Design an enzyme around this catalytic site. Structure first.
Site, PDB file in Angstrom:
ATOM      1  N   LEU A  17       0.805  -1.216   0.000  1.00 23.39           N
ATOM      2  CA  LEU A  17       0.000   0.000   0.000  1.00 23.39           C
ATOM      3  C   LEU A  17       0.840   1.269   0.000  1.00 23.39           C
ATOM      4  CD1 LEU A  17      -2.687  -1.159   2.555  1.00 23.39           C
ATOM      5  CD2 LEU A  17      -2.908  -1.088   0.039  1.00 23.39           C
ATOM      6  N   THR A  19       4.670   3.384   1.787  1.00 26.70           N
ATOM      7  CA  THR A  19       5.608   3.506   2.893  1.00 26.70           C
ATOM      8  C   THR A  19       5.358   4.808   3.637  1.00 26.70           C
ATOM      9  OG1 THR A  19       7.260   2.199   1.713  1.00 26.70           O
ATOM     10  CG2 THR A  19       8.023   3.573   3.559  1.00 26.70           C
ATOM     11  N   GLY A  20       5.280   4.718   4.960  1.00 31.73           N
ATOM     12  CA  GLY A  20       5.071   5.890   5.782  1.00 31.73           C
ATOM     13  C   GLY A  20       6.246   6.130   6.702  1.00 31.73           C
ATOM     14  N   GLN A  21       6.086   7.048   7.656  1.00 34.17           N
ATOM     15  CA  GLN A  21       7.169   7.332   8.591  1.00 34.17           C
ATOM     16  C   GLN A  21       7.718   6.054   9.213  1.00 34.17           C
ATOM     17  N   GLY A  23       7.416   2.875   8.061  1.00 36.09           N
ATOM     18  CA  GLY A  23       7.749   1.783   7.170  1.00 36.09           C
ATOM     19  C   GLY A  23       6.662   1.385   6.194  1.00 36.09           C
ATOM     20  N   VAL A  25       3.456  -0.500   4.586  1.00 32.25           N
ATOM     21  CA  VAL A  25       2.145  -1.040   4.916  1.00 32.25           C
ATOM     22  C   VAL A  25       1.673  -1.889   3.747  1.00 32.25           C
ATOM     23  CG1 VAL A  25      -0.161  -0.551   5.775  1.00 32.25           C
ATOM     24  CG2 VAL A  25       1.713   1.044   6.242  1.00 32.25           C
ATOM     25  N   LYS A  39       0.994  -3.188   9.030  1.00 34.30           N
ATOM     26  CA  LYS A  39       2.036  -2.182   9.161  1.00 34.30           C
ATOM     27  C   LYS A  39       3.289  -2.866   9.680  1.00 34.30           C
ATOM     28  CE  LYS A  39      -1.619   1.110  10.035  1.00 34.30           C
ATOM     29  NZ  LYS A  39      -2.092   2.191  10.936  1.00 34.30           N
ATOM     30  N   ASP A 130      -4.205  15.998  16.164  1.00 36.74           N
ATOM     31  CA  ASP A 130      -3.808  16.213  14.768  1.00 36.74           C
ATOM     32  C   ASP A 130      -4.946  15.825  13.830  1.00 36.74           C
ATOM     33  OD1 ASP A 130      -2.189  17.059  12.661  1.00 36.74           O
ATOM     34  OD2 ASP A 130      -1.128  15.142  12.530  1.00 36.74           O
TER      35      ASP A 130
HETATM   36  N1  YXJ Z   1      -5.733   1.008   7.481  1.00 32.09           N
HETATM   37  C1  YXJ Z   1      -5.476   1.024   6.187  1.00 32.09           C
HETATM   38  O1  YXJ Z   1      -6.197   0.456   5.354  1.00 32.09           O
HETATM   39  C2  YXJ Z   1      -4.215   1.737   5.775  1.00 32.09           C
HETATM   40  N2  YXJ Z   1      -3.377   2.101   6.754  1.00 32.09           N
HETATM   41  C3  YXJ Z   1      -2.240   2.726   6.440  1.00 32.09           C
HETATM   42  C4  YXJ Z   1      -1.919   3.012   5.107  1.00 32.09           C
HETATM   43  N3  YXJ Z   1      -0.750   3.630   4.761  1.00 32.09           N
HETATM   44  C5  YXJ Z   1       0.152   4.197   5.774  1.00 32.09           C
HETATM   45  C6  YXJ Z   1       1.108   5.250   5.255  1.00 32.09           C
HETATM   46  C7  YXJ Z   1       1.821   4.774   4.012  1.00 32.09           C
HETATM   47  C8  YXJ Z   1       0.747   4.589   2.966  1.00 32.09           C
HETATM   48  C9  YXJ Z   1      -0.254   3.533   3.381  1.00 32.09           C
HETATM   49  N4  YXJ Z   1      -2.745   2.649   4.119  1.00 32.09           N
HETATM   50  C10 YXJ Z   1      -3.884   2.011   4.420  1.00 32.09           C
HETATM   51  N5  YXJ Z   1      -4.726   1.663   3.415  1.00 32.09           N
HETATM   52  C11 YXJ Z   1      -4.714   1.978   2.041  1.00 32.09           C
HETATM   53  C12 YXJ Z   1      -5.741   1.406   1.298  1.00 32.09           C
HETATM   54  C13 YXJ Z   1      -5.835   1.643  -0.066  1.00 32.09           C
HETATM   55  C14 YXJ Z   1      -4.911   2.436  -0.729  1.00 32.09           C
HETATM   56  C15 YXJ Z   1      -5.021   2.663  -2.222  1.00 32.09           C
HETATM   57  C16 YXJ Z   1      -6.161   3.633  -2.532  1.00 32.09           C
HETATM   58  C17 YXJ Z   1      -6.362   3.843  -4.019  1.00 32.09           C
HETATM   59  N6  YXJ Z   1      -5.103   4.225  -4.667  1.00 32.09           N
HETATM   60  C18 YXJ Z   1      -4.056   3.225  -4.425  1.00 32.09           C
HETATM   61  C19 YXJ Z   1      -3.760   3.108  -2.942  1.00 32.09           C
HETATM   62  C20 YXJ Z   1      -3.896   3.013   0.018  1.00 32.09           C
HETATM   63  C21 YXJ Z   1      -3.783   2.787   1.386  1.00 32.09           C
END
Ligand code: YXJ
EC number: 2.7.10.2
Length: 253
Positions: A17, A19-21, A23, A25, A39, A130
């Site tokens: 999905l 990378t964040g602060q 690491g 996901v 995560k 925040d």
């Molecule tokens: N709880 C969660 O579902 C979730 N938690 C953290 C997180 N992060 C943390 C920071 C780093 C980036 C991902 N992503 C999460 N879900 C998530 C679900 C779908 C996408 C798609 C949406 C459509 N376009 C493509 C991407 C991106 C991210």
């Protein structure tokens, strides 16, 4: 960690999905059946103390409009944190990239979803600190949920004057940020005060400048977000009043 401890053998990884602060996901499945976000906490990206912190908050607060922790994998390094899967990603990106999915009726329901989450946090005397679209998430049904409450680059643009001058945080500074978040929603994800720096913003809001009404916000919707920015904290509504206000407008929409 009791019944919060998940066996990493029960996880399966499907897509990255981002990378964040802390690491990478990934999206995956838990026990073959449940969609989860996994995560993978980058080693050193976060202290043991900081994890005991985050864990305490996440296993003791729970609401339909808060992203729900499912469990942790702490008996190895890197740590895994397993949470509810929010299939449509971050609200800020959703507002900017998925505009074909909603009308102004849905924009107001996004605000109501967040308002329910924060009325719950208010009832527990817990500050988010925040609140902003970057910390809201959207599931496959379009439900918006709040995350990262109390995890606290300073969010100047979401802060009231008494935070910026005195570090006076309260339910009423979350109220202010919620007003700014409704502005983010109705502006389809613009940066608040998009032509000013942080330093310019702090001076301007201290002098009484406020965010203009986004074109998609009705006068009644604007009155709600504007009530969050009263210079006197004790004149700002509670989240319970805001929720009642939002429901009334949805009944008139
Ligand atoms: N709880 C969660 O579902 C979730 N938690 C953290 C997180 N992060 C943390 C920071 C780093 C980036 C991902 N992503 C999460 N879900 C998530 C679900 C779908 C996408 C798609 C949406 C459509 N376009 C493509 C991407 C991106 C991210």
């Amino acid at each position: 960690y009791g019944s919060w401890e998940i066996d990493p053998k029960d996880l399966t990884f499907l897509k990255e999905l981002g990378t964040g602060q802390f690491g990478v996901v990934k999206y995956g499945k838990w026990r073959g059946q449940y969609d989860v976000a996994i995560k993978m906490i980058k080693e050193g990206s976060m202290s043991e103390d900081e994890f005991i912190e985050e864990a305490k908050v996440m296993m003791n607060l729970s609401h339909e409009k808060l992203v729900q922790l499912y469990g942790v994998c702490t008996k190895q390094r890197p740590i895994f944190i397993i949470t509810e899967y929010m299939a449509n990603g971050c609200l800020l990106n959703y507002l900017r990239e998925m505009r074909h999915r909603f009308q102004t009726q849905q924009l107001l329901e996004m605000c109501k979803d967040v308002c329910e989450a924060m009325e719950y946090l208010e009832s527990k005397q817990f500050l988010h600190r925040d609140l902003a679209a970057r910390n809201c998430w959207v599931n496959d049904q379009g439900v918006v949920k709040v995350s990262d409450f109390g995890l606290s680059k300073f969010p100047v643009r979401w802060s009231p004057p008494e935070v910026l001058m005195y570090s006076k945080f309260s339910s009423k500074s979350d109220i202010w940020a919620f007003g700014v978040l409704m502005w983010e929603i109705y502006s389809l994800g613009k940066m608040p005060y998009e032509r000013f720096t942080n330093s310019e913003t702090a001076e301007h809001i201290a002098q009484g400048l406020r965010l203009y009404r986004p074109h998609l916000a009705s006068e009644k919707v604007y009155t709600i977000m504007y009530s969050c920015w009263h210079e006197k904290a004790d004149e700002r509504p509670t989240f319970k009043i805001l929720l009642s206000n939002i429901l009334d407008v949805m009944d008139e929409e």
